[PDB]
Amino acid sequence: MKIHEFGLALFGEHYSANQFAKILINKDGSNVDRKTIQNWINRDQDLNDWVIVQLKEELLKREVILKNLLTNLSQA
Amino acid sequence: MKIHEFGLALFGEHYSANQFAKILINKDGSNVDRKTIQNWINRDQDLNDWVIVQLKEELLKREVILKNLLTNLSQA
């Protein structure tokens, strides 16, 4: 898996490595570095399981928030 | 209506005005300028109807992208 499809869903077409840096956590609790994520983009790397799990939690959290908004704004 | 919930749904906790400048267009088809959106965020302005619709577009397209990626990641 690549980060690209995650970036479209969490941040849109123009997602940055910096945008992932504010939500990505290392196993020991440190922030994941913007330059590490840039390397993922630059080398089009497959992601490790820890990051996929971390990103998959964000997607399920965002789906809840997005669904509440869509409900509150239905039928303009 | 305020942009804050839209920023949460579209870009998360650390959303910026520039992320909006890249998806918002003026009626004539020109881009919306970062400093107008900075004013909306900074002073918590009420949103205009033309803006609300464009953001509603964004929410609805994202659900489709986001719900689909989740079906490709179901049951780890």
Tab-separated table of N, CA and C in Angstrom:
chain	number	residue	atom	x	y	z
A	1	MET	N	0.804	-1.216	0.000
A	1	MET	CA	0.000	0.000	0.000
A	1	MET	C	0.825	1.248	0.000
A	2	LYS	N	0.322	2.256	-0.681
A	2	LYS	CA	0.966	3.547	-0.736
A	2	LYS	C	0.137	4.546	0.042
A	3	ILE	N	0.795	5.633	0.442
A	3	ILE	CA	0.106	6.658	1.205
A	3	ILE	C	-0.847	7.433	0.311
A	4	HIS	N	-0.659	7.367	-1.014
A	4	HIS	CA	-1.354	8.291	-1.913
A	4	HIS	C	-2.868	8.198	-1.752
A	5	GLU	N	-3.412	6.979	-1.754
A	5	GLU	CA	-4.863	6.868	-1.668
A	5	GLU	C	-5.365	7.369	-0.321
A	6	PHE	N	-4.557	7.214	0.734
A	6	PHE	CA	-4.918	7.748	2.038
A	6	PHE	C	-4.975	9.265	1.994
A	7	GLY	N	-3.999	9.880	1.309
A	7	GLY	CA	-3.937	11.335	1.211
A	7	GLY	C	-5.138	11.949	0.515
A	8	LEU	N	-5.661	11.283	-0.511
A	8	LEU	CA	-6.859	11.799	-1.158
A	8	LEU	C	-8.024	11.838	-0.184
A	9	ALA	N	-8.175	10.791	0.629
A	9	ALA	CA	-9.313	10.707	1.548
A	9	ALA	C	-9.135	11.572	2.793
A	10	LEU	N	-7.912	11.702	3.314
A	10	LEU	CA	-7.721	12.508	4.519
A	10	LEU	C	-7.448	13.979	4.226
A	11	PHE	N	-6.907	14.321	3.046
A	11	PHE	CA	-6.493	15.696	2.781
A	11	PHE	C	-6.780	16.217	1.368
A	12	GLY	N	-7.321	15.410	0.452
A	12	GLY	CA	-7.577	15.903	-0.892
A	12	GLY	C	-6.389	15.763	-1.831
A	13	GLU	N	-6.539	16.377	-3.012
A	13	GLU	CA	-5.546	16.222	-4.078
A	13	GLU	C	-4.176	16.734	-3.673
A	14	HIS	N	-4.126	17.820	-2.912
A	14	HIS	CA	-2.843	18.469	-2.674
A	14	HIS	C	-2.345	18.225	-1.257
A	15	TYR	N	-2.364	16.965	-0.843
A	15	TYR	CA	-1.930	16.602	0.491
A	15	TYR	C	-0.420	16.714	0.587
A	16	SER	N	0.071	17.050	1.770
A	16	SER	CA	1.503	17.158	1.967
A	16	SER	C	1.977	16.155	3.005
A	17	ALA	N	3.279	15.874	2.969
A	17	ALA	CA	3.855	15.066	4.031
A	17	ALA	C	3.660	15.746	5.379
A	18	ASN	N	3.652	17.079	5.398
A	18	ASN	CA	3.469	17.790	6.652
A	18	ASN	C	2.091	17.521	7.238
A	19	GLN	N	1.089	17.345	6.381
A	19	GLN	CA	-0.243	17.047	6.883
A	19	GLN	C	-0.286	15.703	7.605
A	20	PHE	N	0.509	14.731	7.156
A	20	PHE	CA	0.562	13.454	7.853
A	20	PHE	C	1.343	13.557	9.153
A	21	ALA	N	2.309	14.472	9.217
A	21	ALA	CA	3.142	14.631	10.406
A	21	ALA	C	2.347	15.039	11.649
A	22	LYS	N	1.185	15.663	11.473
A	22	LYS	CA	0.402	16.126	12.604
A	22	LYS	C	-0.558	15.065	13.133
A	23	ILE	N	-0.689	13.930	12.465
A	23	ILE	CA	-1.548	12.857	12.947
A	23	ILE	C	-0.837	11.529	13.072
A	24	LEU	N	0.423	11.424	12.679
A	24	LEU	CA	1.103	10.137	12.676
A	24	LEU	C	2.007	10.000	13.903
A	25	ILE	N	1.890	8.860	14.601
A	25	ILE	CA	2.622	8.590	15.835
A	25	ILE	C	3.492	7.358	15.636
A	26	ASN	N	4.706	7.400	16.183
A	26	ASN	CA	5.626	6.274	16.155
A	26	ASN	C	5.199	5.303	17.244
A	27	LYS	N	5.753	4.107	17.280
A	27	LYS	CA	5.315	3.139	18.318
A	27	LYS	C	5.687	3.644	19.715
A	28	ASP	N	6.881	4.211	19.878
A	28	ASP	CA	7.298	4.687	21.208
A	28	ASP	C	6.633	6.002	21.626
A	29	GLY	N	5.684	6.510	20.838
A	29	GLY	CA	4.931	7.697	21.172
A	29	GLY	C	5.436	8.989	20.575
A	30	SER	N	6.584	8.977	19.899
A	30	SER	CA	7.088	10.173	19.235
A	30	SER	C	6.290	10.496	17.965
A	31	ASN	N	6.372	11.762	17.551
A	31	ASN	CA	5.794	12.165	16.281
A	31	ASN	C	6.587	11.550	15.140
A	32	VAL	N	5.888	11.132	14.088
A	32	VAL	CA	6.580	10.704	12.880
A	32	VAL	C	7.001	11.939	12.100
A	33	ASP	N	8.210	11.901	11.544
A	33	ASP	CA	8.824	13.083	10.957
A	33	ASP	C	8.358	13.359	9.532
A	34	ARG	N	8.176	14.652	9.250
A	34	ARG	CA	7.782	15.115	7.925
A	34	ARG	C	8.724	14.589	6.854
A	35	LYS	N	10.016	14.490	7.166
A	35	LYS	CA	10.966	14.065	6.148
A	35	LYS	C	10.916	12.560	5.914
A	36	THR	N	10.457	11.791	6.913
A	36	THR	CA	10.273	10.355	6.742
A	36	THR	C	9.123	10.104	5.787
A	37	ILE	N	8.036	10.840	5.992
A	37	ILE	CA	6.858	10.718	5.150
A	37	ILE	C	7.157	11.242	3.753
A	38	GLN	N	7.944	12.320	3.650
A	38	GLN	CA	8.360	12.762	2.328
A	38	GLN	C	9.101	11.660	1.590
A	39	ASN	N	9.981	10.932	2.281
A	39	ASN	CA	10.655	9.797	1.658
A	39	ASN	C	9.653	8.771	1.153
A	40	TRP	N	8.571	8.549	1.892
A	40	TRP	CA	7.553	7.620	1.410
A	40	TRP	C	6.973	8.104	0.092
A	41	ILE	N	6.647	9.388	0.020
A	41	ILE	CA	6.115	9.924	-1.220
A	41	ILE	C	7.184	9.874	-2.311
A	42	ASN	N	8.399	10.342	-2.009
A	42	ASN	CA	9.409	10.474	-3.058
A	42	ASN	C	9.799	9.123	-3.632
A	43	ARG	N	9.873	8.089	-2.796
A	43	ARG	CA	10.255	6.776	-3.286
A	43	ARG	C	9.047	5.884	-3.514
A	44	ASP	N	7.830	6.416	-3.353
A	44	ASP	CA	6.592	5.650	-3.545
A	44	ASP	C	6.607	4.332	-2.766
A	45	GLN	N	7.017	4.392	-1.497
A	45	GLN	CA	7.196	3.173	-0.718
A	45	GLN	C	5.873	2.542	-0.287
A	46	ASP	N	5.883	1.216	-0.159
A	46	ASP	CA	4.809	0.533	0.546
A	46	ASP	C	4.896	0.885	2.028
A	47	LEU	N	3.748	1.038	2.665
A	47	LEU	CA	3.685	1.412	4.067
A	47	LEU	C	3.770	0.185	4.971
A	48	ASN	N	4.304	0.381	6.177
A	48	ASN	CA	4.324	-0.699	7.162
A	48	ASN	C	2.981	-0.817	7.893
A	49	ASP	N	2.792	-1.969	8.537
A	49	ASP	CA	1.528	-2.258	9.200
A	49	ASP	C	1.175	-1.215	10.248
A	50	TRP	N	2.159	-0.757	11.019
A	50	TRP	CA	1.842	0.216	12.053
A	50	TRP	C	1.228	1.485	11.456
A	51	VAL	N	1.781	1.977	10.344
A	51	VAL	CA	1.245	3.194	9.743
A	51	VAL	C	-0.128	2.934	9.140
A	52	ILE	N	-0.290	1.806	8.437
A	52	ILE	CA	-1.596	1.468	7.869
A	52	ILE	C	-2.668	1.422	8.961
A	53	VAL	N	-2.350	0.819	10.114
A	53	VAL	CA	-3.328	0.781	11.195
A	53	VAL	C	-3.616	2.183	11.692
A	54	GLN	N	-2.569	2.987	11.872
A	54	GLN	CA	-2.763	4.345	12.365
A	54	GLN	C	-3.625	5.150	11.401
A	55	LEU	N	-3.334	5.056	10.110
A	55	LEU	CA	-4.116	5.757	9.063
A	55	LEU	C	-5.536	5.194	8.972
A	56	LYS	N	-5.730	3.901	9.182
A	56	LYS	CA	-7.074	3.280	9.071
A	56	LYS	C	-7.965	3.738	10.212
A	57	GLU	N	-7.394	4.061	11.365
A	57	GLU	CA	-8.129	4.621	12.525
A	57	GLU	C	-8.578	6.029	12.153
A	58	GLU	N	-7.697	6.813	11.545
A	58	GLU	CA	-8.059	8.160	11.143
A	58	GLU	C	-9.217	8.134	10.161
A	59	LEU	N	-9.195	7.209	9.217
A	59	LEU	CA	-10.277	7.126	8.206
A	59	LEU	C	-11.607	6.796	8.874
A	60	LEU	N	-11.610	5.904	9.842
A	60	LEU	CA	-12.883	5.555	10.497
A	60	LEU	C	-13.358	6.697	11.385
A	61	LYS	N	-12.444	7.486	11.919
A	61	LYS	CA	-12.828	8.636	12.763
A	61	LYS	C	-13.415	9.726	11.869
A	62	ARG	N	-12.800	9.977	10.717
A	62	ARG	CA	-13.239	11.031	9.769
A	62	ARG	C	-14.582	10.684	9.140
A	63	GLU	N	-14.844	9.414	8.869
A	63	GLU	CA	-16.136	8.951	8.313
A	63	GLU	C	-17.285	9.320	9.253
A	64	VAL	N	-17.079	9.210	10.559
A	64	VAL	CA	-18.104	9.550	11.582
A	64	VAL	C	-18.387	11.048	11.551
A	65	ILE	N	-17.343	11.865	11.567
A	65	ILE	CA	-17.438	13.348	11.571
A	65	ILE	C	-18.112	13.826	10.287
A	66	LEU	N	-17.693	13.284	9.156
A	66	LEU	CA	-18.217	13.643	7.823
A	66	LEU	C	-19.678	13.246	7.724
A	67	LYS	N	-20.071	12.136	8.327
A	67	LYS	CA	-21.472	11.664	8.257
A	67	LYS	C	-22.349	12.530	9.139
A	68	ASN	N	-21.841	13.039	10.249
A	68	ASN	CA	-22.662	13.923	11.073
A	68	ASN	C	-22.888	15.239	10.366
A	69	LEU	N	-21.837	15.776	9.749
A	69	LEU	CA	-21.968	17.006	8.985
A	69	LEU	C	-22.954	16.851	7.844
A	70	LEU	N	-22.830	15.771	7.072
A	70	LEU	CA	-23.735	15.598	5.946
A	70	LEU	C	-25.174	15.522	6.414
A	71	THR	N	-25.388	14.913	7.569
A	71	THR	CA	-26.764	14.795	8.102
A	71	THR	C	-27.290	16.178	8.479
A	72	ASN	N	-26.487	16.965	9.174
A	72	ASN	CA	-26.906	18.309	9.636
A	72	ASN	C	-27.140	19.247	8.465
A	73	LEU	N	-26.509	18.992	7.345
A	73	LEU	CA	-26.675	19.940	6.228
A	73	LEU	C	-27.609	19.347	5.185
A	74	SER	N	-28.252	18.217	5.433
A	74	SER	CA	-29.046	17.661	4.311
A	74	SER	C	-30.209	18.552	3.926
A	75	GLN	N	-30.490	18.519	2.627
A	75	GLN	CA	-31.530	19.273	1.890
A	75	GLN	C	-31.367	20.760	2.180
A	76	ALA	N	-30.420	21.374	1.478
A	76	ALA	CA	-30.069	22.798	1.594
A	76	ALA	C	-31.347	23.641	1.653
B	1	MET	N	-23.389	30.188	9.263
B	1	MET	CA	-22.622	28.953	9.317
B	1	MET	C	-21.114	29.285	9.317
B	2	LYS	N	-20.331	28.498	10.051
B	2	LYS	CA	-18.897	28.704	10.164
B	2	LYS	C	-18.131	27.622	9.410
B	3	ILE	N	-16.907	27.958	8.992
B	3	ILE	CA	-16.106	27.011	8.235
B	3	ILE	C	-15.534	25.895	9.113
B	4	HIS	N	-15.553	26.071	10.434
B	4	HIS	CA	-14.807	25.202	11.347
B	4	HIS	C	-15.181	23.730	11.195
B	5	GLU	N	-16.473	23.419	11.104
B	5	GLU	CA	-16.818	22.012	10.988
B	5	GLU	C	-16.374	21.461	9.643
B	6	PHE	N	-16.385	22.299	8.607
B	6	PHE	CA	-15.927	21.874	7.288
B	6	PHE	C	-14.444	21.581	7.300
B	7	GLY	N	-13.669	22.415	7.997
B	7	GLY	CA	-12.245	22.172	8.111
B	7	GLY	C	-11.965	20.869	8.826
B	8	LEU	N	-12.753	20.560	9.860
B	8	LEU	CA	-12.577	19.289	10.549
B	8	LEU	C	-12.871	18.125	9.619
B	9	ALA	N	-13.933	18.240	8.833
B	9	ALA	CA	-14.337	17.110	8.007
B	9	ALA	C	-13.420	16.951	6.817
B	10	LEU	N	-12.927	18.060	6.278
B	10	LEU	CA	-12.081	18.030	5.093
B	10	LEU	C	-10.602	17.900	5.403
B	11	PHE	N	-10.121	18.465	6.498
B	11	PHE	CA	-8.650	18.471	6.679
B	11	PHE	C	-8.239	18.105	8.100
B	12	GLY	N	-9.194	17.984	9.005
B	12	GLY	CA	-8.856	17.556	10.366
B	12	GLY	C	-8.682	18.676	11.355
B	13	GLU	N	-8.024	18.376	12.452
B	13	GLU	CA	-7.825	19.343	13.543
B	13	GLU	C	-6.927	20.485	13.085
B	14	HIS	N	-5.935	20.202	12.256
B	14	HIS	CA	-4.949	21.255	11.926
B	14	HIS	C	-5.130	21.813	10.532
B	15	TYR	N	-6.373	22.080	10.160
B	15	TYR	CA	-6.711	22.610	8.826
B	15	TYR	C	-6.216	24.041	8.709
B	16	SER	N	-5.851	24.433	7.505
B	16	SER	CA	-5.385	25.808	7.254
B	16	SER	C	-6.203	26.426	6.130
B	17	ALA	N	-6.161	27.741	6.019
B	17	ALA	CA	-6.866	28.440	4.944
B	17	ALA	C	-6.354	28.069	3.555
B	18	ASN	N	-5.062	27.762	3.430
B	18	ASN	CA	-4.513	27.416	2.124
B	18	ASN	C	-5.074	26.108	1.573
B	19	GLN	N	-5.407	25.158	2.438
B	19	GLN	CA	-6.026	23.932	1.951
B	19	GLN	C	-7.369	24.230	1.296
B	20	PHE	N	-8.062	25.261	1.788
B	20	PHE	CA	-9.321	25.677	1.197
B	20	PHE	C	-9.099	26.425	-0.104
B	21	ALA	N	-8.008	27.191	-0.211
B	21	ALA	CA	-7.794	27.985	-1.420
B	21	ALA	C	-7.673	27.117	-2.661
B	22	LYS	N	-7.307	25.852	-2.485
B	22	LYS	CA	-7.085	24.936	-3.583
B	22	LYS	C	-8.327	24.144	-3.997
B	23	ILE	N	-9.448	24.275	-3.287
B	23	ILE	CA	-10.707	23.647	-3.686
B	23	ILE	C	-11.842	24.645	-3.868
B	24	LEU	N	-11.654	25.908	-3.514
B	24	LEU	CA	-12.699	26.913	-3.623
B	24	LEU	C	-12.406	27.839	-4.793
B	25	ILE	N	-13.430	28.063	-5.605
B	25	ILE	CA	-13.394	28.900	-6.789
B	25	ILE	C	-14.459	29.973	-6.650
B	26	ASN	N	-14.189	31.125	-7.239
B	26	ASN	CA	-15.192	32.164	-7.270
B	26	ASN	C	-16.181	31.876	-8.402
B	27	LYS	N	-17.314	32.582	-8.375
B	27	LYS	CA	-18.394	32.293	-9.312
B	27	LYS	C	-17.903	32.314	-10.755
B	28	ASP	N	-16.991	33.238	-11.044
B	28	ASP	CA	-16.415	33.388	-12.401
B	28	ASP	C	-15.441	32.254	-12.717
B	29	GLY	N	-15.101	31.417	-11.748
B	29	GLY	CA	-14.204	30.301	-12.070
B	29	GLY	C	-12.786	30.584	-11.662
B	30	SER	N	-12.558	31.747	-11.080
B	30	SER	CA	-11.214	32.127	-10.591
B	30	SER	C	-11.004	31.539	-9.201
B	31	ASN	N	-9.756	31.402	-8.770
B	31	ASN	CA	-9.486	30.870	-7.440
B	31	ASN	C	-9.809	31.880	-6.350
B	32	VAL	N	-10.277	31.359	-5.217
B	32	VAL	CA	-10.471	32.167	-4.022
B	32	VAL	C	-9.126	32.377	-3.351
B	33	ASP	N	-8.892	33.596	-2.885
B	33	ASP	CA	-7.585	33.991	-2.380
B	33	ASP	C	-7.402	33.586	-0.915
B	34	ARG	N	-6.176	33.172	-0.567
B	34	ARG	CA	-5.885	32.725	0.798
B	34	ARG	C	-6.261	33.771	1.852
B	35	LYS	N	-6.106	35.074	1.552
B	35	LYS	CA	-6.367	36.049	2.612
B	35	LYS	C	-7.864	36.220	2.868
B	36	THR	N	-8.716	35.975	1.874
B	36	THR	CA	-10.140	35.997	2.180
B	36	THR	C	-10.495	34.833	3.102
B	37	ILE	N	-9.961	33.651	2.815
B	37	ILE	CA	-10.247	32.511	3.668
B	37	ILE	C	-9.579	32.680	5.036
B	38	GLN	N	-8.373	33.256	5.079
B	38	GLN	CA	-7.765	33.562	6.373
B	38	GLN	C	-8.684	34.430	7.229
B	39	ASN	N	-9.315	35.443	6.621
B	39	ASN	CA	-10.279	36.258	7.354
B	39	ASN	C	-11.442	35.428	7.875
B	40	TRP	N	-11.964	34.509	7.067
B	40	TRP	CA	-13.074	33.681	7.530
B	40	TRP	C	-12.689	32.874	8.765
B	41	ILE	N	-11.533	32.214	8.709
B	41	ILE	CA	-11.069	31.422	9.843
B	41	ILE	C	-10.726	32.317	11.019
B	42	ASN	N	-9.977	33.387	10.768
B	42	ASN	CA	-9.424	34.149	11.878
B	42	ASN	C	-10.502	34.846	12.693
B	43	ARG	N	-11.502	35.437	12.043
B	43	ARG	CA	-12.541	36.147	12.776
B	43	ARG	C	-13.826	35.348	12.917
B	44	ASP	N	-13.822	34.066	12.536
B	44	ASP	CA	-14.989	33.182	12.649
B	44	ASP	C	-16.232	33.734	11.948
B	45	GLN	N	-16.075	34.115	10.688
B	45	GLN	CA	-17.167	34.721	9.940
B	45	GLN	C	-18.244	33.701	9.594
B	46	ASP	N	-19.461	34.203	9.437
B	46	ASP	CA	-20.509	33.409	8.823
B	46	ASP	C	-20.204	33.191	7.341
B	47	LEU	N	-20.519	31.995	6.850
B	47	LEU	CA	-20.238	31.639	5.470
B	47	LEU	C	-21.354	32.088	4.528
B	48	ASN	N	-20.948	32.408	3.303
B	48	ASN	CA	-21.832	32.766	2.205
B	48	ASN	C	-22.418	31.517	1.532
B	49	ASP	N	-23.607	31.664	0.939
B	49	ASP	CA	-24.287	30.518	0.332
B	49	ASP	C	-23.482	29.902	-0.804
B	50	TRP	N	-22.845	30.722	-1.626
B	50	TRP	CA	-22.044	30.175	-2.714
B	50	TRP	C	-20.928	29.293	-2.161
B	51	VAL	N	-20.333	29.701	-1.042
B	51	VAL	CA	-19.263	28.918	-0.437
B	51	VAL	C	-19.811	27.612	0.139
B	52	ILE	N	-20.918	27.684	0.868
B	52	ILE	CA	-21.469	26.489	1.494
B	52	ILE	C	-21.702	25.390	0.468
B	53	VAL	N	-22.213	25.756	-0.716
B	53	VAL	CA	-22.501	24.739	-1.722
B	53	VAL	C	-21.220	24.086	-2.189
B	54	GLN	N	-20.188	24.891	-2.446
B	54	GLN	CA	-18.935	24.312	-2.911
B	54	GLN	C	-18.360	23.365	-1.877
B	55	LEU	N	-18.428	23.740	-0.600
B	55	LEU	CA	-17.953	22.846	0.441
B	55	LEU	C	-18.836	21.614	0.540
B	56	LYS	N	-20.142	21.776	0.354
B	56	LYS	CA	-21.007	20.607	0.363
B	56	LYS	C	-20.607	19.638	-0.739
B	57	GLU	N	-20.287	20.157	-1.932
B	57	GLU	CA	-19.728	19.311	-2.981
B	57	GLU	C	-18.550	18.506	-2.460
B	58	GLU	N	-17.613	19.180	-1.797
B	58	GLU	CA	-16.414	18.507	-1.324
B	58	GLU	C	-16.730	17.388	-0.352
B	59	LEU	N	-17.630	17.637	0.595
B	59	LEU	CA	-18.001	16.593	1.537
B	59	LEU	C	-18.524	15.366	0.805
B	60	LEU	N	-19.438	15.579	-0.136
B	60	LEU	CA	-20.081	14.461	-0.802
B	60	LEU	C	-19.104	13.659	-1.661
B	61	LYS	N	-18.172	14.329	-2.337
B	61	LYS	CA	-17.162	13.601	-3.109
B	61	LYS	C	-16.221	12.815	-2.196
B	62	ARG	N	-15.832	13.402	-1.052
B	62	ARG	CA	-14.921	12.719	-0.141
B	62	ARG	C	-15.533	11.459	0.435
B	63	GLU	N	-16.810	11.506	0.829
B	63	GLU	CA	-17.428	10.292	1.348
B	63	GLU	C	-17.239	9.158	0.368
B	64	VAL	N	-17.374	9.458	-0.923
B	64	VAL	CA	-17.276	8.408	-1.918
B	64	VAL	C	-15.854	7.876	-1.973
B	65	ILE	N	-14.866	8.772	-1.970
B	65	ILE	CA	-13.473	8.328	-1.939
B	65	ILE	C	-13.177	7.598	-0.631
B	66	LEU	N	-13.559	8.211	0.483
B	66	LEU	CA	-13.246	7.670	1.822
B	66	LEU	C	-13.966	6.363	2.098
B	67	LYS	N	-15.243	6.247	1.769
B	67	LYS	CA	-15.948	4.987	2.090
B	67	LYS	C	-15.390	3.872	1.228
B	68	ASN	N	-14.965	4.182	0.014
B	68	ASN	CA	-14.434	3.135	-0.846
B	68	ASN	C	-13.096	2.624	-0.336
B	69	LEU	N	-12.194	3.511	0.060
B	69	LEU	CA	-10.872	3.052	0.550
B	69	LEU	C	-11.042	2.106	1.737
B	70	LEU	N	-12.019	2.368	2.588
B	70	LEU	CA	-12.325	1.566	3.792
B	70	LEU	C	-12.801	0.163	3.416
B	71	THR	N	-13.451	0.007	2.276
B	71	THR	CA	-13.935	-1.322	1.837
B	71	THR	C	-12.758	-2.135	1.309
B	72	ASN	N	-11.702	-1.456	0.890
B	72	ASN	CA	-10.457	-2.089	0.416
B	72	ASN	C	-9.563	-2.417	1.607
B	73	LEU	N	-9.922	-1.974	2.800
B	73	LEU	CA	-9.097	-2.210	4.001
B	73	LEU	C	-9.930	-2.931	5.055
B	74	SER	N	-11.103	-3.432	4.703
B	74	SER	CA	-11.964	-4.084	5.715
B	74	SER	C	-11.402	-5.412	6.197
B	75	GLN	N	-11.674	-5.720	7.465
B	75	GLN	CA	-11.229	-6.910	8.226
B	75	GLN	C	-9.763	-7.195	7.926
B	76	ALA	N	-8.904	-6.386	8.547
B	76	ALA	CA	-7.428	-6.386	8.517
B	76	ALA	C	-6.848	-7.720	8.065
